Symmetry: C3
Subunit: 163 residues, 3 copies
């Protein structure tokens, strides 16, 4: 045995109902889940690290075995620092599957202890992505069905402060 610790890395820009489903599903199967929010220096997110962590803590903080940490650099160095059992990713489409397969094999070559496990989304979240949500919010669409209420309000406060 040992305590199991899975990292769920992502930009979470912002967190969606799909991410919440995956982290809830993962929190039942592993002892510790780490929502790892990739800072994105030369990468350019709409929401800051602080907004993204806060939105994630607001949707998932009710789960006792879930932590929230920002990271940058090589996912495999973060994996080693965190003493993780595995990385978790969701697979929504064929393009995700092919990229994820390539990355899992590259990461296994950089660190032979590396491991990646995948979840498939429930069909009610299969069409939701952060990118599409950003696009709908920008064009003044209602994203309430796809994201937690706190994210809806953050899109309004992003508007109010400019946008």
């Amino acid at each position: 045995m040992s305590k199991t610790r899975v990292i769920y890395p992502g930009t979470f820009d912002p967190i969606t109902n799909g991410h919440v489903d995956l982290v809830t599903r993962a929190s039942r199967m592993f002892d510790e889940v780490v929502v790892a929010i990739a800072i994105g220096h030369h990468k350019n997110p709409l929401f800051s690290l602080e907004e993204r962590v806060a939105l994630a803590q607001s949707s998932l903080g009710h789960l006792s075995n879930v932590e929230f940490v920002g990271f940058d650099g090589l996912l495999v160095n973060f994996f080693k620092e965190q003493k993780a059992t595995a990385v978790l990713r969701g697979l929504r489409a064929v393009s995700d599957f092919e990229y994820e397969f390539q990355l899992a094999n590259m990461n296994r070559q950089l660190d032979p202890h590396f491991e990646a496990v995948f979840l498939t989304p429930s069909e009610q979240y299969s069409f939701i992505s952060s990118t599409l949500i950003r696009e709908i919010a920008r064009l003044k669409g209602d994203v309430t069905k796809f994201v937690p209420q706190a994210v809806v309000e953050a899109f309004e406060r992003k508007h109010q402060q400019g946008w």
Copy 2:
């Protein structure tokens, strides 16, 4: 019954022989076809709205049941304003199919009356895209086989005025 009205949205940057085939095929199956040319503010097309509408009217104006309108904003708001029966898209490749499936489901959640129908291109236009045509024209290739003659001339006049 009722009059049927399908929207064919696209950047049409520029219109190709493939788009002409799709709109001709659609004009036989529905009472009204709307060639909906997405303006592309924060999106950056090579040809202006005016050039794109004109090139489209020159290739398709001979069809009595086809209209040409520029739009911006949420495709579902345009769908509602236009009182459309459905959106039409072509599916050339697997990547188109997966994106289109995701968008149709997202749009159905924003508007339950939304509908998307798809056409597959004839094999003689299956390899043609606006993006590839732009690339060939930029590098001084002959695009005559892939686009109407008016688009060929517009590439020459884009050159002459700089390029």
Copy 3:
């Protein structure tokens, strides 16, 4: 018969163990192989033409039937200038396959003598791409397993001179 001459075009930014495998495999099947390094004006490579040719000559110059040339413009014009039998490409993933199929058909329409042959990588290089190697090197990862030693050193000298 006739002497056979295949072009292997790419950005080779930088050359990887995967490219070396493909060119070695091709050099056994055709009389002449041309490693054709696309300059990339409005395209933006990390390594210059000179660095890329040099890195390629260092990994592949031991093969007597392999030449190294920079090119820009239309691949079909380069194909005609070089009097080539065919273009060679590797196919790593489904997305490569669909793009390559589209390009082969477009190029056949621009030049009916055009021809494209494809190789599948050995599984030990199936997960390696230039883009991923760039990402790992930027974040200070070790790329030694994926690229020739000369490329490793070039990443160090790219660092030292800034980065």
